[PDB]
From Swiss-Prot, chain A:
In eukaryotes there are five DNA polymerases: alpha, beta, gamma, delta, and epsilon which are responsible for different reactions of DNA synthesis. Catalytic component of the DNA polymerase epsilon complex which participates in chromosomal DNA replication. Required during synthesis of the leading DNA strands at the replication fork, binds at/or near replication origins and moves along DNA with the replication fork. Has 3'-5' proofreading exonuclease activity that corrects errors arising during DNA replication. This is DNA polymerase epsilon catalytic subunit A. Belongs to the DNA polymerase type-B family. DNA polymerase epsilon is a heterotetramer consisting of POL2, DPB2, DPB3 and DPB4. It is found in: Nucleus. The chain holds residues 1927 to 2074 of 2222 of the full protein.
Curated annotation (Swiss-Prot), chain B:
This is Cell division control protein 45. Transmembrane segments: none annotated. The keyword Nucleus applies. Assembles into a complex with MCM5/CDC46. Interacts with MCM10. Keywords: Cell cycle, DNA replication, Nucleus, Phosphoprotein. Present with 1730 molecules/cell in log phase SD medium. GO terms for biological process: DNA replication initiation; double-strand break repair via break-induced replication; mitotic DNA replication preinitiation complex assembly. The gene is CDC45. Belongs to the CDC45 family. It is found in: Nucleus. Its main location: nucleus.
Amino acid sequence: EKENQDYTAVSQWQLKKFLSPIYQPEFEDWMMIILDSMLKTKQSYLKLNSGVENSLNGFSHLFSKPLMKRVKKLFKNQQEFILDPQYEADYVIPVLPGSHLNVKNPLLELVKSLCHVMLLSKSTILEIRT
Amino acid sequence: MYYGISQFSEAYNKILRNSSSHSSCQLVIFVSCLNIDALCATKMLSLLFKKQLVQSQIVPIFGYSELRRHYSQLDDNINSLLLVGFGGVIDLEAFLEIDPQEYVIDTDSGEQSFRRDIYVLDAHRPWNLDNIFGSQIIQCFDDGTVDDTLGEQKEAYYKLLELDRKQRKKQIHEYEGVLEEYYSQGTTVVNSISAQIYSLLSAIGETNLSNLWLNILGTTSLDIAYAQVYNRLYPLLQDEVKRLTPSSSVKTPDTLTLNIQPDYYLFLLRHSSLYDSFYYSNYVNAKLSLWNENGKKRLHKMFARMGIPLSTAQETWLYMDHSIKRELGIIFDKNLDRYGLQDIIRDGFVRTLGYRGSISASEFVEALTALLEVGNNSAQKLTNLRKRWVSNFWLSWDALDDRKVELLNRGIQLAQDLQRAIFNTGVAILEKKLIKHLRIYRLCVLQDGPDLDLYRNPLTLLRLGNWLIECCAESEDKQLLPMVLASIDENTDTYLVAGLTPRYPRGLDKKPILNNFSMAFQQITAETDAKVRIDNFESSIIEIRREDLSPFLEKLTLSGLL
């Protein structure tokens, strides 16, 4: 019997380990942002409606505007320090026993992973596709 | 400096004193393949060594690593090496790990001799100062720019090497500043290899009509991007043609003649239609802007004004009615001034023999260039592809012979097809506006298009590049800018990047512009970890991966050495 209900957030992505070490904590950061926006959208929809698509439709209007700017800033940082030997140690790909693919752009792989975990929604797949 | 022109003959004598032996082969000529000038130069050298019986091994080389592989496997019996078309920019001791201590024989008295001679026949005017001055083993066939221009650098290098506080810093840093001002300078050509070897043949006395024709081809092949060189070397060729011509006649099957006659600045005039010659010419599309539909309308309108019907103009030149082609000079003089095509009028060299037709020098060198181009896990593909262009080079060498005119006609047809592909991809670039302005250089990246597998060849990409520079040079609204031309290869998955210098319009008549892409390419390769290939003899030709292309261009536009 708690207003916060003693909720906790669990993130157990093994997808994060197939990324460069600079780009690993940003994946968890954006997953936390996605989770918080999804809870806020679900609460707003539930409070509005109660007084095929789920409660989660339209959740990406809350955070697409920071995300486009963040991806563009990360792209500007990407086109400077990938070939520089000082910052290349953060940009390497790790070798894992499950890995079979080869990365070509780490930011492309991060954007694909984020859009694929956002793409698992069966309801708002059109908006996530846009 | 080590060989001025008046002692080229002496250098050849030294070659005889190392190679005129019937028992063994001792002379190996390293030729830069994919170059018309080196091809004609090695043809004249091979004729000269065939007439005097010198054993030879002619080896075509594409890359610098290919040079290092071929020089590493050379036998110690070889004492004469000729480097044709390359070897004038890099340091050959630092590249071929050359140390004079294990190559010296009979040092005793201030005399030094070596067991191997390496001669350089290079047209790239940035000359390495160690190579030209401090090297005994590497012998340069200099045009004469060392006696006029490179004297301050000579004394700076000599007091740098001789003298191994404020006085020492004040003179040594000044001489190093002079040397580093001579270095980091762009690449240019002012003389052809064929002219230097024909000067050697004039010094010896083995000149004839065939060597003169090969010299004419070697000089004419530089008329695309180095027209000042051709305009400088034209009166010497005129004097030689009027010297070695016979007294006079009737057309007979044995009399080869080589006339100085009007040879207009057209693509394949005597082996195609007049409509296709004006339509596929770089200068005509450069001025009248034939890439859009208005240029084609203007070309048809000037065909109406010249009085040539399109049925007659599209007919083959050999089957053309000669009421059009006999007074074509008068028609050109009367009609081309209103459309701005006055510079089509140009006197060139036309050779014919027997009854098999006339060939110009320009048509012959485009046929030879086409026979270089399309004449016939990734590292195996690159090795097979380098072997393919070496086979193309030897096919073009086979086309240089008089008895193999079928190879020449195959080269003519290949030149027509390749110019059709170049025209289609050029209007593909111009219609959708892939040329981007980057305020210091102009960028053109080919991602996809018609028959993109022809652009893994260097000279085909240079043909497209010269097409773009000629088309953009006559447009005065955008000023002179260097061009980056990148073409993608999907199977190799590499962007082959070419650096193209701009040029002034052909009608104007000064100091030639330099090629500042090699300095930036070397500095970005040194500073960054880009996996790139620098091995091409033309240093503006590099290969980048697809994923490393955009950081390379960002570091290129950040660098101010363009």
